[model samples]
Structures are given as C-alpha cells and as structure tokens.
Target chain A: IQSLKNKLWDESENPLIVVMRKITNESSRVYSQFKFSNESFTRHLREYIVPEILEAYVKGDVKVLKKWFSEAPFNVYAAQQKIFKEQDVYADGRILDIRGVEIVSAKLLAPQDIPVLVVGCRAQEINLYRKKKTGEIAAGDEANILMSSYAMVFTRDPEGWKILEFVRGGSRQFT
Target chain B: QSLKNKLWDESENPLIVVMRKITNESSRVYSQFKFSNESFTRHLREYIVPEILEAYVKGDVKVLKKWFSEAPFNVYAAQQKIFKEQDVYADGRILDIRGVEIVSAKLLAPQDIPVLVVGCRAQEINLYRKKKTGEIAAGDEANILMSSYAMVFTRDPEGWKILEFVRGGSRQFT
Candidate 1:
C-alpha cells in the first residue's frame, strides 16, 4: 500500500500535488527532535524557502502559488483581489518592490509545532505609498523588519500549510 | 580548454618524460633527459628540485618537506642532506604562495639537482571570511607543488584500459 501510494504520488502530473502529498506523508511518518529554531529556520529559508518561492514565481502558475502560499500570513483571497484590482493601475510595471530582497543572512530563534519554523530573516523590504491628495509619487523607503509568525498546518478538504498570523516591526534604514 | 592546452604544453619536462618512459617501456632511460626548453624545464622543475619554495611561501612547511622526500629526483641520501639544510623561521608570519611567481627552473647536471627560482610580492594578504560558531565550517585552502604525477603508457587488453596515479600530498597534506 505504501509503495502504491508512493508510485501514485511520484507519477502525479501536477508538481504542486506531488510536493503536497510528499510533505503530508513525510510529516506523518517522520518524527524527530527536528524542531526548527529561529536560527535554523532562517537558514532553511535562505537555503530552501526562498528558492522555492522564486521557482513558483518563475512558473507563473497561480494555482501552484495558491497551494504553496496556503501558509502565507496574509489573506490569500484578499491579496489576490487587490492584485487583480490594481493590475490596471500599475499595468506593465515591473515588480521592482520585491526584487533585491534577499536573505543576506538569517538565524532560527525558537521552534514550536504550532509554528513549524521560526526564522529571523535579515532582508531588505521596500515599501511604496502614493499620496492621496497631491497625486504626487512618493519615493519608496527601504527598511529592515523583524518578522514573527505562527505557521499553522491547515489540513482539511484542501490540505496545506498556512501562516495563521504574522507581525513585522523592527529597525528601518537606507542601504 | 586553453588552460588545459597550456598545461599540456608545459608538461614536456624530465619528470613527465620519466613518467612516460616508465609506463611506456618499463625503462629507466628517462633519467638521462636534459632540461632544454623553458616550459619543459618549468614542468619538470618541481620533480628535479629537492625543496619546494612555493609550499614554504604558502606557510605549508609540512607539505613542503614531505614533497622533498617523495620526489623521484632526490633518491638515497641526497633528499636528507637538503632537508637538513632547509631554513625555517618562527615569526608566526606565513609565506604567501599566491604572491610567489615562478621565475626560472633549471636542472644541475653534477648533483642531479633541480632548482626553481621564485619571486615574492610585497603586499598585505587579504582576509575573506572569519570562523563562525556552531555552524558548518569550510575547509582551508593550501598550496602544494605537484612534484610527480602517475600515468599509464599501455592499454590493458581485458576489462577497461585503466590509468593509475599516486601523487605527493595524498594522506598527509589534505
């Protein structure tokens, strides 16, 4: 039965499905003192998480992102709505805000099952805000935020991982 | 590929000639080959020389002495005499191998001695990274001159035609 399930999972046409099934099975079958601390979590993000996110972005398959981002802290549905609504407003504009935000370094702080990984990412965040009254373009600001979050396992009819909640507050500077 | 071509061009020395001879015809006639061309002489320079100045420059004294013993040029007691005469300083300062450039290489006929001339740069060394705690560490970089290389001259009829090599810094330096 295990072999059959493995075969089915491996032969799946959708990569997202394959990843989901593999993660689910591995999470259940494997148990270790493998708790991710704040330092290690950041390491994992630098080594593993960021690459996966970039891969999804390159693929441009909204469905794959929807599945993988099930763990994101923000409301996926609302984010999607905002993106679509603003699509015309910023039409043909490159997503420069997210670019160059690399994990310069990171550390894992603590580990809990409720939040599988607690990583402190040393990254650059660029924020752009438009003036409502003046209709003037305000230059964006680059800041460093210490983000914390609860990464919950949201397994149901459509099983996945999701960031139930997250807070970002830290130092800001230009570099 | 150009670097490989240059390496091949430089490999026309006595040591490589010896390697080719021993593997090619199982003869010791390779010892008679003289250092004629600059590139050829440079190629065989390490093999003929008893002392490796580059290893000394790299602050790899352990590898330098080991190479002196293993080189085919210094057989019998000649290796020991040179080893005894070798100079070592205890200032905790390291010889930077990267700064040392090969000036010339020559084989002395009377003593069958190989000499390699080297010039050093007068500049401060660059430090790239520091040691980290509780994390995976990377290996250190060291310079070891290639004294002698192994080769295969003939092809085995059965199984796959194989070539074997036994180099100097195998067990000790790495």
Candidate 2:
C-alpha cells in the first residue's frame, strides 16, 4: 500500500520538492553580501546609465544614444532606422519624466564578462499625441501616474553598462 | 509523466518564468521581503515536525506547543480536549519520518506561513499510524498514524510555526 502510494505520490509537487532539498539546506550561504547587494552594478545604473538614457529618450538624441548602446544586435542603430526621432516624439503637454531606476536582478553570466542587470523603473510617456506630418491631436491629455514597471536588460563593461534590451509595460502594483 | 519528461517540459516553458515578475516585484515590499525563490523556500519543511507525535506519547504539551505555531497553539488548545480523549497516542507509538521534502514554500506574508498552503510530505511509513518496536501496533494503536501531512506553517520573528493541518493532502490526489 505504501509502495503504491509512493507511486501515487510522485507527481509535480513531490518531485519538485525532492529537487528543493539541497537549496533548502544551504540557502543562507548562497548569497554573498557584496555580490547580492552589488554596488558596482547599482552604482553604474544610478550614477551613469539611467540619467544618460532617460535624457536621450526625452530629448530625442538618437545620435548620442547610438554611440552609447550596442553594435551587432545593435540596439540604437537598429531602432533609429524605424523611428521619425524628432518628428515622432513631438507631442503636446507631453512632459515625459524619468523617475529613479531600480535593479531587479543583477548577476554575472560569466565571471570574466559583465553582469546582466534587470533595471526596473517608472518614467513619463506621451500624455498628448499629435500627428507627425500635420499637428493633429490624435490623442491628448491623461493623468500623470507613476504606476508602471519598466524592466530593461543591461550588460556592463569597463566602459560602463549598455542597454541590451528594453522591456516595458508591466502592471504598477507599487513596489 | 516521469521526472525527466517533466524536467525537460518545464525547462522549455517560459510562462512559469515570465509569469511572476509583477508578483515578485510587489512581493519585495513586505517587511522581511518575501524571498521565496528557489534557494529561500524549504528550511520550514524537512525540519518542523520530524516527529510531532513522538512527544505526545510522553504527553508533553510543552513539546506539542513547541511543535505547533502561534495560531495552531490556539487551534490545538481548542482541540486538546478531544486529542486527550482520543489521545492520538498509541502505546508510545513512534511516527518516524526518516526523510521528508517540501513541495513548495510560498511566502504569503502578513499572513504568516499559515494561510499559505505550502505542501510537504514524509517518506513512507511501513507499518501503522502508531508504531511500537519495529512494527506498528495495528488498530489498537488509535490515531498515531505515521503519515505525510500537507500541514500549514507560519513564520513570525521567532521562526516557522505549524498551522492548519490536513492529513494526506499530498498523497490523496485521485
């Protein structure tokens, strides 16, 4: 009966629990204060990358952004091809602001390589939108709510960090 | 399916990984930070009730209180009368859990670890609910069932405490 129940018991939760055993016994030792609370990663974001990217985004300085971002899977150079840039961003009463940045997950995929950053943030967006060709008010005026989660992936180097990918629009349940 | 099939199946699926960023983001706002990631779960299981009823044969309520959590103290306190009558003990019977594993340790905070239906289980007990010597004493042993319970637990500043218990919540899926 017990053997049959063992057969019965071995399901998703049961097997997963068996896998969970080792991580449980020694989880406290897993994180290092220096590594987990990575100063180089956070400082790189707070002091350098966040401000520069936000400034470039709002000001529509694609040239400076292209210089700053990636090369082959090239972030800025590729993205710039699709957008009107100065023409595209032109909006009415559209005061897009950058709130502070957040580091969600920071880990080095390779010890020799730079750490990957899961940067969370809230920033302003187009409150009013007008047509690029003619200044027609296609959409206008919305509440300024700093309630959205934007997670941008970044990879760091000696030159500092570059935005690997930008993922935005998760619910702002407030952290 | 076998564990290998599920293992590879789970590896390819992004929904479970992509599923929880919002929840994980909001989860950190708690006081202690609900770090219920892979490494941070367990510890509560595999340790709590190694032999909860073993002390009961000794009739040690202090030991029972220690084995139970904050609210379960009141719950078992309320249930103690019947527990005493039924005794839930059998001839100094032992409920040996030589091994156990945590199904999951979800941190549902401000809710303690109770209310969070975290699953856990024991290895198979060969004999009866109540065991004496090598073999369990069969029917006369009463409710000293050596079993796996998907019991609830709560964590205070103190540590993990046992909460609402449901016997066979793990092995009973069928």
Candidate 3:
C-alpha cells in the first residue's frame, strides 16, 4: 500500500497501475460468488458417483461406460469404436473387466467450472480367443500390473456432473 | 486422429496455416500465434534448425546453446551421436540439411504458448567409428531416418527461442 503513497499522486492517472488493481479486484470479486466450504461438492462426490461406476464395471459392462461419457462433448465416440472392437465378442466372448478403481485427485478446471477426476485403475487380465478356432485364451494375459494413469474430467451441468474427458498422462487421450 | 502429415497445398487450406476452421474464438490476426511480428516462417526455416545443426556438426557448443532456449550444453553431443559413431565428421567438415515439414502447429492456452510440431528427414545417416571396437549401435549407418520432433518456439522479447523438443509420430508405417 505504501507504493501507492503520495509519490503515487503524480502518477494517479496511470493506466498500468489502475488496470493492475482492476484485474486483481475483478477476479477476486468473481471468485467470491463460489464459497469453498459449502460449494466444494467434494463431500457428496464419492458417495454419489464412485460406487455406481465400480460395481457395474465388473462384467466389462458397456452400459456403465456409457453412463460416464454419455453426454460428453468430445470425440470419445471415435475411441469408443476402438475400445469396443478390442472386446472380442466372437470366439470365447470374454472382455477385460475392471478389477478396481482409485481416485488420485479431484480438482476444478477453468472456464466451464467443471470438476476433473484423476484416477488409478487396474483392469483384469484379458483373454482373447485363438484365431484358429480353438476357443482358448490367446494373445492375452499380457500384464498383471495395475495402470495408475487414468485421468478424467467432469462436466458440470444443470442436472449434475458428467465425465467429459479422459487424459492418458499429460497428453489428451481418446482411449 | 485426423489424417495428419498429408502434404496440403498452402493456398487450399488457410485454416491449417492458421489454426482450426470452426473454432468459436478466432480473430483474423490469430495466425500471428503461428508467425508473429515481422517474422516470416521462411526466414525462421532458413535460420532456426539449420543454424543449430550447423553448430552441432562444427562442435561449437556455444552456438548451439544460444540457438536454443533450454540448457543446450549436451545438444551437440546428442545430435552428433549417429554422425560421430558413423565417423562422418572426421575433421573440419560441414553438414547439409535438405528439408523440413511442419506436421503440426498449435497455440496452447493460459499463456497462449506456441508450439511447432515438425518432422525433419535426414539423408545418408551412416556413423563410422572403430569397427574393431564394436560393430553396432542402433540404426543401420546407411539408413535415412525421418525424425519427428516436436519443438516449442517462443516468439517474443528474445526473438525466437526453442524451448523444448520431443520425438512424436510413430512412423512405423514407413
């Protein structure tokens, strides 16, 4: 505040200083509209959304995946084709099921004010049947290690929140 | 992914030259996100990477350091690994660079940082070291490898600074 002292009187009309204060004042004023303790939604977040996704993911359920990305506004549909094609519906007809899910962090992103969830998820070892019609596990059981690289963004809507994006590592991921 | 790297006639696609076509927020001068100020891309092409590579071949680490924004002390050695192992730069020899194609370019948000995702194809990549010392490194010395490099280019107070570089694109189909 001393920097804005009587020495600042001569420069009282400075656009640079005036705009600096305005920028700070404007953002803080806007931020006050949302209170942290009450508006965080973190309290009901897990109980509301987590159990639903986990229980349904046991059978490699398609309906469950749909629930997360149903109204998403990204090009997930392009990757949806890739994910479904690898399901191997023909031979033995077994798909890779989700064994567990762990949320690493949850935060709010800018502009649209949507909540994003970063997670560590492990999937069960998948078994694709042989192309030779043996009806046996082939080209599967590759890795038993858990992949903790799942990061997804949530879109806040009037109805509630929906998952909008999933990033693999720092890069944007269609998968 | 959309079909990237197909050579498009520049006049035909200005959006790629600028950014995207249907982006909701784009002013006419936003192409400056690509080539800003009095800068011409052709000028940047003739200068940026070529000069950096020239210094590398010449073993002038100082020039390479100034040519990039990051700590570039190791750039000369890293770039010359294939060439030196191939024993191409025996003594006081100059290097040649033919072409550069920008596979992708985009302006990232928050600070509107610009990035140039480019592919550089090198010819006659044969490293000649002590054959009796060891007979292998990685690629065939005679192989002409097309390296896909993603570089962040900052165009501002310091002119153009090459901030970072990462290898992109699988090039497996090649």
- lDDT winner among the candidates? 2
Model 1's DockQ?
0.01
Ranking by DockQ: 3, 2, 1
State the DockQ, from 0 to 1, for candidate 3: 0.02
Sorted on TM-score, best first, the list reads 2, 3, 1
DockQ of each: 0.01, 0.02, 0.02
The best candidate by TM-score is 2
lDDT of 1 by residue, B68-146 (tens): 3333323423533443354322211222223323333344334433333332222111112222332222212222122
TM-score each candidate: 0.23, 0.33, 0.30
Q: Which residue pairs collide in model 3, if any?
A: B85-B127, B86-B127, B86-B128, B87-B128, B126-B141
> Whose DockQ is higher: candidate 1's or candidate 3's?
3
What share of the reference contacts survives in each candidate?
0.00, 0.00, 0.00
Per-residue accuracy of model 1 over A135-159 as CA lDDT, tens digit each:
3444332221111111222221222
Worst 10 residues of 3 chain A by lDDT: A166-175
Query: Model 3: residues >4 Å from true position, as ranges?
Result: A1-175, B1-39, B56-60, B71-105, B109-116, B124-141, B167-174
What C-alpha lDDT, on a 0 to 100 scale, does residue B131 get in candidate 2? 27
Q: Residues B30-54, candidate 3, lDDT per residue (tens digit)?
A: 4765444334445545877666555
Q: Pairing residues by index, what is the TM-score of model 3?
A: 0.30
Q: On residues A1-175, what C-alpha lDDT tens digit does candidate 2 reach at each position?
A: 1332233234323222232221122223323423435556566576677767755554445676775566742454456546544456453543255565666454444335444555666655534556777878665445322233355666644444576555334222221
